[PDB]
Amino acid sequence: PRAPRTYSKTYSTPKRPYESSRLDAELKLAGEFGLKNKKEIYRISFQLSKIRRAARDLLTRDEKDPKRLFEGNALIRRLVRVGVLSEDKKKLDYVLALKVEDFLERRLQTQVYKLGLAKSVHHARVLITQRHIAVGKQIVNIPSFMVRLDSEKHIDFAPTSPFGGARPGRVARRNAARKAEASGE
Amino acid sequence: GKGKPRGLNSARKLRVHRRNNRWAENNYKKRLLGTAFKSSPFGGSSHAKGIVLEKLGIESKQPNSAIRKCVRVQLIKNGKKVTAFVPNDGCLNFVDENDEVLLAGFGRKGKAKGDIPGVRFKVVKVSGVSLLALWKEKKEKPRS
Amino acid sequence: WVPVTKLGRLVKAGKITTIEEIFLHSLPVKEFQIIDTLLPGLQDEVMNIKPVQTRFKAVVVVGDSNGHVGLGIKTAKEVAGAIRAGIIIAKLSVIPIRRGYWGTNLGQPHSLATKTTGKCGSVTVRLIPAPRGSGIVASPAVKKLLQLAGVEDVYTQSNGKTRTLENTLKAAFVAIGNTYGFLTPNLWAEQPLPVSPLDIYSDEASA
RNA sequence: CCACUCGGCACCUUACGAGAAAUCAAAGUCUUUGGGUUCUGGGGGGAGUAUGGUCGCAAGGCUGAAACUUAAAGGAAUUGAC
RNA sequence: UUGUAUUGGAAUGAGUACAAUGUAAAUACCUUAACGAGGAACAAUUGGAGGGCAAGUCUGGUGCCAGCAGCCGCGGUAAUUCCAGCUCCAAUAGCGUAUAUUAAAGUUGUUGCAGUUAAAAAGCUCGUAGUUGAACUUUGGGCCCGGUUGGCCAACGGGGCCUUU
């Protein structure tokens, strides 16, 4: 038969289910950033767990070990590109100090709110899913898209929507017609 | 010290010693002897199906006081005879003799649960419909 | 206040200004107002209350998240009374903690300097230094004590009947106190021995 | 009789220590975990029962289960009802 | 600038569809003319609310019975645990149950357990296999070359020769 398609799971569940202090801290994040699930938080802490594991391993190697230089620099290069790590903190020991809020800050949903365009994180999410926002030329309709530092200059309304310059939408058009029909008595 | 050999060439005695002592672990011994095939009514499966012979009430253990509702069942694949509990009160009206029922374990890995002496299993489905759906009035049961 | 002990008089007069002097000379502390003025940021947490035959037993931890912690246990006939008196006992027991680095010494200590153990009853608690961003890996009761001390990263292991709550807290409290007992090579240098403040200000302290 | 020394059955004093405690010159030198080596245990019953083997004139000895059943059984030390 | 309730325009795909694209021919995805929200009926579930373990001194019923309950337990009118109604909690296009197995388990222990009184040192001694077994033989001192790193010089590595070799 054809070779197998590979796949993997992308989140992990906390091990104590009803810890009151954890439950409160999670709900504050969901309200601040407009998430719908706890799963959306578990996804980010799962990613950060793998990043720390990799860095923590390399730090046991000798300095000037060729592997530590090659893979260490790649890891840092990659986190700076998305703006999770500040260009001042460009050192492997600062990678261990990252926290969940640093990743949430870079989602398309929150960027579209900091720039204007939207007047709340809840208003922002609806605009993205309804195909009004473009990044460069491409329409993007996924809220969790991570905005690279070069892309921020190019977020704007899509050319094929109202707000962006096209014809009015279906409901606006219906109303104008019915009024004209009554006025065109 | 510590009463076990430490020497660098003593590996044979260490592993032989561990093998002898694992037979005191309760669940280890069950696997290696194959107890679940030779005995116990479900021959190692999680569920089994049977025919209802007769309807019973079981007096609860003291200090509790209740007459709890049970049935005698004969398993189709073995012919072994078993007693099962029927959950959810009035649900006993849904079962009658020569009905066919699906049984599950009562959660305690072969021990009896709570007040009920000697009852290890509970009814899940009767005549192909689930008791939970009947109790909540979501489906109907045909007679036969 | 009107201090009654010799040390209290020097503190109220403003001759002694940091608690590090008191630890350095290993002086006894008898008046809780002394801690209350040298260490104002201290805050308290109540760990347990249970009724006993009726009386109430309360377990209280106090600290500031910057290197000082204390523990106290009191039984009293009223819930508010037990907490009140529990805080007084905890303030008197304050001790310092030594904290350090898991690896290279960039930018302020964040973990313990060495492995340490403590024992009380059957229970034993062991603390191990951890790399940055691990957090405190401990059960909820022990986790709170380590937070108020101001530790950021530490692993723990334990043995014995940990379900007896007060034996567990006492064992952990012993373990963090031992951090200053362990001699390490950067402490090998030789120092002149200071003069005690009770000598220098002897006439301020009397009468 | 006095001083010293090797070996032995005990005693008194001492706790860096150990322990759940009673207590301990080892029951110490163990989360700061490694001097060498032999045997035994893994919740309580069923049960030192059944079955096979082997030793004995016999009484019996040595080796030695499972089905099933149950939420405790057990150690040390405090206070003190009618 | 933040809550609680009378009122107004905007935005959109679920779905349907001319067409083109796709394909061996098709279906579907991606694209698109027309149509397609006001209880937006275009109505989110599955388990719980004594403790372990987030969340009710609420209100009606019932009679140790029907029932609940992994465990401790609740119930004999005065039910924080049964049954129903309100309200609240948790995960959420998913949630619950049974059986096996991994972690928790330093309850199988090489790392790393225990054997006076809690389970456990064999009546005693000899003895084969097995495991284990005291100290000692070229050490030190000179002279060149010498690579790497750090700020000529210092540290760390390395080669050659002499000294009875």
Curated annotation (Swiss-Prot), chain A:
Residues bearing PTM Phosphoserine: S183
Main location: cytoplasm
SUPFAM superfamilies: Alpha-L RNA-binding motif
Gene name for this UniProt entry: RPS9A
Record keywords, A-Z: Cytoplasm, Isopeptide bond, Nucleus, Phosphoprotein, Ribonucleoprotein, Ribosomal protein, Ribosome biogenesis, RNA-binding, rRNA processing, rRNA-binding, Ubl conjugation
InterPro entries membership: Ribosomal_uS4 (IPR022801), Ribosomal_uS4_CS (IPR018079), Ribosomal_uS4_euk/arc (IPR005710), Ribosomal_uS4_N (IPR001912), S4_RNA-bd (IPR002942), S4_RNA-bd_sf (IPR036986)
Any Gene Ontology biological process: ribosomal small subunit biogenesis
Cross-link (Glycyl lysine isopeptide (Lys-Gly) (interchain with G-Cter in ubiquitin)): K179
Subunit annotation: Component of the small ribosomal subunit (SSU). Mature yeast ribosomes consist of a small (40S) and a large (60S) subunit. The 40S small subunit contains 1 molecule of ribosomal RNA (18S rRNA) and 33 different proteins (encoded by 57 genes). The large 60S subunit contains 3 rRNA molecules (25S, 5.8S and 5S rRNA) and 46 different proteins (encoded by 81 genes). Interacts with snoRNA U3. uS11 interacts with MPP10. Component of the ribosomal small subunit (SSU) processome composed of at least 40 protein subunits and snoRNA U3.
Record's keyword annotation contains Flavoprotein: no
Coiled coil: none
Cellular location(s): Cytoplasm; Nucleus, Nucleolus
Domain S4 RNA-binding: from-to ranges: 106-180
Pfam families noted in UniProt: Ribosomal_S4, S4
Entry GO CC: 90S preribosome; cytoplasm; cytosol; cytosolic small ribosomal subunit; nucleolus; nucleoplasm; small-subunit processome
Protein name according to UniProt: Small ribosomal subunit protein uS4A
GO molecular function terms attached to this record: rRNA binding; structural constituent of ribosome
Note: Present with 106000 molecules/cell in log phase SD medium. There are 2 genes for uS4 in yeast.
Membership in a protein family: Belongs to the universal ribosomal protein uS4 family.
UniProt region (Disordered), positions on chain: 159-185
Swiss-Prot record, chain B:
Pfam families named among the record's database cross-references: Ribosom_S12_S23
This protein's record includes keyword Nuclease: no
Family annotation (PROSITE patterns): RIBOSOMAL_S12
A single GO molecular function term of this UniProt record: structural constituent of ribosome
Post-translational changes noted in the entry: Hydroxylation at Pro-63 affects translation termination efficiency. The stereochemistry of the 3,4-dihydroxyproline has not yet been determined.
Cross-link (Glycyl lysine isopeptide (Lys-Gly) (interchain with G-Cter in ubiquitin)): K55
InterPro entries, A to Z: NA-bd_OB-fold (IPR012340), Ribosomal_uS12 (IPR006032), Ribosomal_uS12_euk/arc (IPR005680)
Modified residues (3,4-dihydroxyproline): P63
Family annotation (Gene3D superfamilies): Nucleic acid-binding proteins
GO biological process: maintenance of translational fidelity; maturation of SSU-rRNA from tricistronic rRNA transcript (SSU-rRNA, 5.8S rRNA, LSU-rRNA); regulation of translational fidelity; translation
Gene Ontology cellular component annotations, sorted alphabetically: cytosol; cytosolic small ribosomal subunit; ribosome
Keywords: Cytoplasm, Hydroxylation, Isopeptide bond, Ribonucleoprotein, Ribosomal protein, Ubl conjugation
Localization per Swiss-Prot or TrEMBL: Cytoplasm
Miscellaneous field: Present with 10600 molecules/cell in log phase SD medium. There are 2 genes for uS12 in yeast.
Family, per entry: Belongs to the universal ribosomal protein uS12 family.
Cited function: Component of the ribosome, a large ribonucleoprotein complex responsible for the synthesis of proteins in the cell. The small ribosomal subunit (SSU) binds messenger RNAs (mRNAs) and translates the encoded message by selecting cognate aminoacyl-transfer RNA (tRNA) molecules. The large subunit (LSU) contains the ribosomal catalytic site termed the peptidyl transferase center (PTC), which catalyzes the formation of peptide bonds, thereby polymerizing the amino acids delivered by tRNAs into a polypeptide chain.
Protein name: Small ribosomal subunit protein uS12A
Organism of provenance: Saccharomyces cerevisiae (strain ATCC 204508 / S288c)
Swiss-Prot record, chain C:
Localization, UniProt: Cytoplasm; Nucleus, Nucleolus
GO CC entries: cytoplasm; cytosol; cytosolic small ribosomal subunit; nucleolus; nucleoplasm; small-subunit processome
Name of the protein described by the UniProt record: Small ribosomal subunit protein uS5
Function: Component of the ribosome, a large ribonucleoprotein complex responsible for the synthesis of proteins in the cell. The small ribosomal subunit (SSU) binds messenger RNAs (mRNAs) and translates the encoded message by selecting cognate aminoacyl-transfer RNA (tRNA) molecules. The large subunit (LSU) contains the ribosomal catalytic site termed the peptidyl transferase center (PTC), which catalyzes the formation of peptide bonds, thereby polymerizing the amino acids delivered by tRNAs into a polypeptide chain.
GO MF, one annotated term: structural constituent of ribosome
Similarity comment: family membership: Belongs to the universal ribosomal protein uS5 family.
Covered range of the whole protein: 35 to 249 of 254
GO terms under biological process: cytoplasmic translation; positive regulation of translational fidelity; ribosomal subunit export from nucleus; rRNA processing; translation
Top-level taxonomy: Eukaryota, Fungi, Dikarya, Ascomycota, Saccharomycotina
Keywords per UniProt: Acetylation, Cytoplasm, Isopeptide bond, Methylation, Nucleus, Ribonucleoprotein, Ribosomal protein, Ribosome biogenesis, rRNA processing, Ubl conjugation
Subunit structure: Component of the small ribosomal subunit (SSU). Mature yeast ribosomes consist of a small (40S) and a large (60S) subunit. The 40S small subunit contains 1 molecule of ribosomal RNA (18S rRNA) and 33 different proteins (encoded by 57 genes). The large 60S subunit contains 3 rRNA molecules (25S, 5.8S and 5S rRNA) and 46 different proteins (encoded by 81 genes). Interacts with snoRNA U3. Interacts with MPP10. Component of the ribosomal small subunit (SSU) processome composed of at least 40 protein subunits and snoRNA U3.
Domain named S5 DRBM: residues: 42-97
